[PDB]
From Swiss-Prot, chain A:
Name assigned to this protein: Transcription initiation factor IIB
Keywords in alphabetical order: Metal-binding, Nucleus, Repeat, Transcription, Transcription regulation, Zinc, Zinc-finger
Cell compartment(s), UniProt: Nucleus
Main location, first listed in the record: nucleus
Function comment: General factor that plays a major role in the activation of eukaryotic genes transcribed by RNA polymerase II.
Sequence repeat copies, ranges: 106-182
Additional notes on this entry: Present with 6750 molecules/cell in log phase SD medium.
Zn finger intervals (TFIIB-type): 4-37
Residue window of the full protein shown: 17 to 217 of 345
Gene Ontology MF annotations: RNA polymerase II complex binding; RNA polymerase II complex recruiting activity; RNA polymerase II general transcription initiation factor activity; TBP-class protein binding; zinc ion binding
Annotated Zn(2+) binding sites: C8, C11, C29, C32
Subunit text: Associates with TFIID-IIA (DA complex) to form TFIID-IIA-IIB (DAB-complex) which is then recognized by polymerase II.
The keyword Zinc-finger belongs to this UniProt entry's keyword annotation: yes
Any single Gene Ontology cellular-component annotation: nucleus
From Swiss-Prot, chain B:
Source species: Saccharomyces cerevisiae (strain ATCC 204508 / S288c)
Assembly, per entry: Component of the RNA polymerase II (Pol II) complex consisting of 12 subunits.
Note: The binding of ribonucleoside triphosphate to the RNA polymerase II transcribing complex probably involves a two-step mechanism. The initial binding seems to occur at the entry (E) site and involves a magnesium ion coordinated by three conserved aspartate residues of the two largest RNA Pol II subunits. Present with 18700 molecules/cell in log phase SD medium.
Residues of the full protein shown: 1079 to 1127 of 1224
Protein name: DNA-directed RNA polymerase II subunit RPB2
TM region(s), chain numbering: none
Protein role: DNA-dependent RNA polymerase catalyzes the transcription of DNA into RNA using the four ribonucleoside triphosphates as substrates. Second largest component of RNA polymerases II which synthesizes mRNA precursors and many functional non-coding RNAs. Proposed to contribute to the polymerase catalytic activity and forms the polymerase active center together with the largest subunit. Pol II is the central component of the basal RNA polymerase II transcription machinery.
UniProtKB/Swiss-Prot annotation, chain C:
Note: Mutagenesis experiments demonstrate that the minimum viable CTD contains eight consensus Y-S-P-T-S-P-[A-S-N-G] heptapeptide repeats. Identical and simultaneous substitutions in a number of consecutive repeats are lethal: 'Ser-2' -> 'Ala-2' (14 repeats), 'Ser-5' -> 'Ala-5' (15 repeats), '2-Ser-Pro-Thr-Ser-5'-> '2-Ala-Pro-Thr-Ala-5' (10 repeats), 'Ser-2'-> 'Glu-2' (15 repeats), 'Ser-5' -> 'Glu-5' (12 repeats), '2-Ser-Pro-3' -> '2-Pro-Ser-3' (15 repeats) and 'Tyr-1' -> 'Phe-1' (12 repeats). The binding of ribonucleoside triphosphate to the RNA polymerase II transcribing complex probably involves a two-step mechanism. The initial binding seems to occur at the entry (E) site and involves a magnesium ion temporarily coordinated by three conserved aspartate residues of the two largest RNA Pol II subunits. The ribonucleoside triphosphate is transferred by a rotation to the nucleotide addition (A) site for pairing with the template DNA. The catalytic A site involves three conserved aspartate residues of the RNA Pol II largest subunit which permanently coordinate a second magnesium ion.
Post-translational modification: The tandem 7 residues repeats in the C-terminal domain (CTD) can be highly phosphorylated. The phosphorylation activates Pol II. Phosphorylation occurs mainly at residues 'Ser-2' and 'Ser-5' of the heptapeptide repeat. The phosphorylated form of Pol II appears to carry, on average, one phosphate per repeat. The phosphorylation state is believed to result from the balanced action of site-specific CTD kinases and phosphatases, and a 'CTD code' that specifies the position of Pol II within the transcription cycle has been proposed.
Residues of the full protein shown: 225 to 280 of 1733
Entry's localization field: Nucleus
Region annotation Lid loop: where it falls in the sequence: 24-36
Length: 187, 49, 56
């Protein structure tokens, strides 16, 4: 069983903040005024662009994509770009990826905001799974991720106008407006 | 008392360059170490070695 | 040496996995992962290894 603690030991209080210090470190209690380890872990010093990754759906890896001017890829580029293009057929690779790439195309075109524009696309990936009367049409639940995506600020909507844009503003929009109300009340 | 050698005296334009001592007096005595190496950190803004 | 080095071992059959201290984590924000590079390639090794066992 994982128990992790910094209790002073000498005068257990159970328990109090011990300081993070500024230079010395080690979190000496303002009570027994002793030590605990040496710290030595700077969290401020995260991996910058100069390795860090902020994944929202599963876990990102990447493959190939060679372009370093050392030795020309030519023959080998097509050797590996074909070989990685064969692998994205093994276990239902398409679906989430297709959804998120088509998602960034429909929003960028209407210039939807990234901070909350991307937020609704996470909601779609939660809505594409779970099986609650979706009567899924792809376009339908996309108008939910077009509404919550515009919820950042009224960037493009005026959500009704973006509804009046393109296709399917009626009964199929109704199925979707309901799905969002059910997802919001879902703890 | 007078000075036995007369001196070269007069105005001359001087610039005040940046990099002032107070902006450079780093001194550490054991502190925050890196995660990967457990070796002291770099830069004086992080209180490094 | 026959004991410490056989030629049959220049070829990798079984690959050792380096622990978390070689390849640390923690990020910049504090609500997401923030992983290491080695881990990425180890995941790439695994996918490439799994899809192979799949076909055979
Ligand atoms: Zn104490």
């Amino acid at each position: 069983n994982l128990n992790i603690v910094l209790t002073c030991p000498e005068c257990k209080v159970y328990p109090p903040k011990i300081v993070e210090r500024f230079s010395e470190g080690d979190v000496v209690c303002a009570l027994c005024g002793l030590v605990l380890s040496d710290k030595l872990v700077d969290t401020r010093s995260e991996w910058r662009t100069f390795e860090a990754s902020n994944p929202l759906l599963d876990g990102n890896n990447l493959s190939t994509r060679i372009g370093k001017g050392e030795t020309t890829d030519m023959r080998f580029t097509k050797e590996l770009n074909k070989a990685q293009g064969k692998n994205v057929m093994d276990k239902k690779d398409n679906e989430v990826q297709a959804a998120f790439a088509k998602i960034t195309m429909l929003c960028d075109a209407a210039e939807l905001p990234k901070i909350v524009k991307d937020c609704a696309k996470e909601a779609y990936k939660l809505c594409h799974d779970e099986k609650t009367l979706k009567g899924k049409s792809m376009e339908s639940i996309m108008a939910a991720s077009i509404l919550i995506g515009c919820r950042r600020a009224e960037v493009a909507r005026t959500f009704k106008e973006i509804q009046s844009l393109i296709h399917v503003k009626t009964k199929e929009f109704g199925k979707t407006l309901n799905i969002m109300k059910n997802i919001l009340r879902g703890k | 008392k007078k000075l036995m050698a007369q001196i070269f005296f007069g105005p001359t334009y001087y610039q005040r360059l940046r990099h002032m001592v107070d902006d450079k007096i780093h001194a550490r005595a054991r502190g925050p170490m890196q995660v990967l190496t457990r070796q002291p950190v770099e830069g004086r803004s992080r209180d490094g070695g | 040496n026959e004991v410490f080095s056989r030629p049959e071992w220049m070829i990798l059959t079984c690959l050792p996995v380096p622990p978390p201290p070689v390849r640390p984590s923690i990020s910049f924000n504090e609500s997401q992962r923030g992983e290491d590079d080695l881990t990425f390639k180890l995941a790439d090794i695994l996918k490439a290894n799994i899809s192979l066992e799949t076909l055979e």
